[PDB]
Ligand SMILES: OC1CCN(Cc2ccsc2)CC1
């Protein structure tokens with residue numbers, strides 16, 4: 001049985017509105033309804049991994065797992081295995097995988113983050129799961145962010161607290177937050193960003209929705225505008241939205257949006273919005289293709305409609321050579337040459353790098369760079385040709401060209417990371433000096449850039 005080089009991943013997000021689901025929810029897992037939908041001819045083909053995020057979930061873990069497994073069994077005739085389930089309050093993540101994947105999946109981690117302080121601590125936050133699938137790390141975050149049209153900044157703060165504090169993936173990657181720990185990271189949930197138009201325009205918005213004319217509404221979607229202004233979700237992707245707003249419906253139909261202020265809403269309007277979203281971030285030059293992104297039309301127990309997204313994701317095999325794991329392969333080397341970091345910091349400490357990668361036996365710490373002033377105010381940290389030659393565990397090009405080097409630039413004075421980034425080894429050539437580049441972030445915000453040249457030697 002050959003190991004796969006591609007899998008498909010189902011991501012679902014549904015704010016259940018504290019109500020039990022209807023007896024049939026198969027449309028969700030089939031990516032049928034509105035938007036970018038899945039071909040009927042694929043209905044019996046199981047996805048490799050199903051990741052289900054709920055919010056306002058009233059069910060027990062046992063009750064929901066029985067509904068999910070039954071649903072998938074009815075669709076596919078496959079009995080899925082439970083990889084992980086984690087619940088914080090009424091926020092839940094379930095990961096299911098085809099039984100043939102059970103021995104391919106390892107290093108399963110779960111965690112949660114509670115957002116807010118005192119008043120604002122008690123029902124919003126995130127749950128997450130990570131694991132290895134053969135040689136590929138996968139992370140999944142289901143977040144229920146702060147509600148209300150006038151709280152986009154709070155949502156952005158919730159996002160930063162979740163990516164800082166959610167402890168998933170390899171703990172040895174200590175300078176790196178979840179936005180750098182995984183080959184593929186999927187972030188989804190009731191992100192609660194709204195269509196930011198005047199209250200008076202509610203009926204106009206509803207009209208536009210009935211005409212399937214989303215352009216003048218998406219131009220006011222807070223998640224798209226905040227992302228465009230680099231306020232949130234920097235370096236994440238989202239498929240184009242081609243489905244109607246998923247919130248806020250009258251229950252038991254989808255014919256009516258319930259937007260008017262009520263005591264039950266705290267006297268807030270809920271103009272129709274795309275609250276329910278799926279975003280991703282994959283390491284550079286890894287295959288990831290969105291094959292569906294839409295909402296169901298026939299599941300009406302909640303004031304939200306379920307959202308689905310599906311992905312092709314590249315994966316690699318668990319490589320063994322005669323040498324590594326457990327020694328270096330002297331036929332392999334990575335040289336980072338004429339490299340410099342451009343930092344936005346106004347500090348004047350010395351800086352060093354750390355190189356982290358599962359292609360190394362352990363992380364590598366450089367000597368200090370030489371600080372210079374840029375012409376527009378910036379700190380430039382020069383490394384010249386002083387960086388350590390990296391000795392990968394396996395030199396085979398079919399392994400090494402699929403790997404990535406995480407880079408942290410750290411203060412000599414404090415050992416704290418000022419910036420994190422990632423470089424692909426999927427080069428156009430080996431034994432050749434080639435340009436490399438990564439932005440650097442810290443707490444998911446842009447803090448600088450790293451650029452220079454790489455020279456990769458493989459056994460070919
Ligand atoms: O693909 C990436 C670069 C191009 N964009 C930037 C953008 C446009 C609206 S929101 C964020 C999407 C992410």
Ligand SMILES: OC1CCN(Cc2ccsc2)CC1
Nearest residue numbers: 368369370382383384385386
């Ligand atoms: O000749 C002096 C300046 C250059 N260094 C090397 C260097 C370059 C970037 S970081 C360290 C050696 C001494």
